[PDB]
From Swiss-Prot, chains A, B:
Substrate binds at residues 11, 13. This is Triosephosphate isomerase. The active site is at residues 95, 167. It is found in: Cytoplasm; Glycosome. Homodimer. Its EC number is 5.3.1.1. HAMAP family: TIM_B. It comes from Leishmania mexicana.
Length: 250, 250
């Protein structure tokens, strides 16, 4: 289909013990990945140094799970210049849980994205609708709303560092995956949107991943859709089966 | 005066480069501390492992600057069980900046405190009034309000792990320190409160620190007050002068 380079990203959320991490990393290192894909591992902040010291599988990069733009008087947070100094140059922003529990709004997400962009980070920005939305046939405008908000703060060239993760709020950690057909419908409308609004050229390289209850048995079917470039995986990433998720992008 | 063991705590907020940290840590390690005081260093999450590997001065402990109670689906955050596994067992909670920018309320602070308590952490809980408060002769009830909220969620014995940091919102990072007399007035009313409400025995061991624009030239005068047990230092802790702040509790 000519698609872009696939992305397989691991989001450990707020989980991990130094022991269990050293176990999973060893399983990941011994997995010979054979095709062109970029694997990404998002550990918690405290665990980032440990992951850097043991992660050796070459198709992998470390990303932070969130950050703030600037260093300063922000107790408890971690900024972007701090993460560059530390060699981490990917970050996941506007992930659902942050939009819901620690109140990050579009414009706020949109600002974290512009700045990371500005800081030379590769960014995976999360968008998606809730079930109430979905049920009001509101899924589409919502996604377009968020993407537009991000887009207003970016330059035509900042897109080269952007990756979108469409995670329907109702599929995250629920066991309730979107059928490939639901997933696929949203990815094409977005691609279409980016295409009309930024450049055909941009929509074609944009990796747009699906996330929300994705596992080793469904990743394959998911991948086969033409506008699905990969995944953002939560629960299944705390397991060896992650191997088989990465291989599904083959 | 018989007072309790003093506390000198360093809060680096969201600042530090691996280089500048390795420089400051070396300055701290070579400072022979001679009296009984517990020094505490709060680095950002990413920097905690680096601090653990180099910090060697024995009167020092590492604390996190914030955390959540439980591990789980909380993207971007770091929990307490994660910090125990990692050997970090002190934490700063309800610091002003968190109460203001990332919306942590009394009850929320009060819950983070009970749980950390429950997790065997030493906790430094922050309370304090804003200038509007101060000007409405509202400083006192406010402090009592917050302390009471914390106290409702703790057991008579949880106090042994609690430390209070009174940081007038108007003195943090402002250059505008509370005179020793303002500081002292608040510490005695609190001590009084804890005394009447929890036990005379408890108020007597409680370390209650002052923080807000505290430096090496004022720490001394600050310390001399009878109900002032130490400090919670922000800006001055990113400097060598921190040495002279620790020595002021002598």
């Amino acid at each position: 289909s000519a698609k872009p380079q696939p992305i397989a990203a691991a989001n450990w959320k707020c989980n991990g013990t130094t022991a269990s991490i050293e176990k999973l990393v060893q399983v990941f290192n011994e997995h010979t990945i054979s095709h062109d894909v970029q694997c990404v591992v998002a550990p918690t902040f405290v665990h980032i140094p440990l992951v850097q010291a043991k992660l050796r599988n070459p198709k992998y990069v470390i990303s932070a799970e969130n950050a703030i733009a600037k260093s300063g008087a922000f107790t408890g947070e971690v900024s972007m210049p701090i993460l560059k100094d530390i060699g981490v140059h990917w970050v996941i922003l506007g992930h659902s849980e942050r939009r819901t529990y620690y109140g990050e709004t579009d414009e706020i997400v949109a600002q974290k994205v512009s700045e990371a962009c500005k800081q030379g980070f590769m960014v995976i920005a999360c968008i998606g609708e809730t079930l109430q939305q979905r049920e009001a046939n509101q899924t589409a405008k919502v996604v377009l709303s968020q993407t537009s908000a991000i887009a207003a703060k970016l330059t035509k060239d900042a897109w080269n560092q952007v990756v979108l993760a469409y995670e329907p709020v109702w599929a995250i950690g629920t066991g309730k995956v979107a059928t490939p057909e639901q997933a696929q419908e949203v990815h094409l409308l977005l691609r279409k949107w980016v295409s009309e609004n930024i450049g055909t050229d941009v929509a074609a390289k944009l990796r747009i991943l699906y996330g929300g209850s994705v596992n080793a048995a469904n990743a394959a079917t998911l991948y086969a859709k033409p506008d699905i470039n990969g995944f953002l995986v939560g629960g299944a990433s705390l397991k060896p089966e992650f191997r088989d998720i990465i291989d599904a992008t083959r």
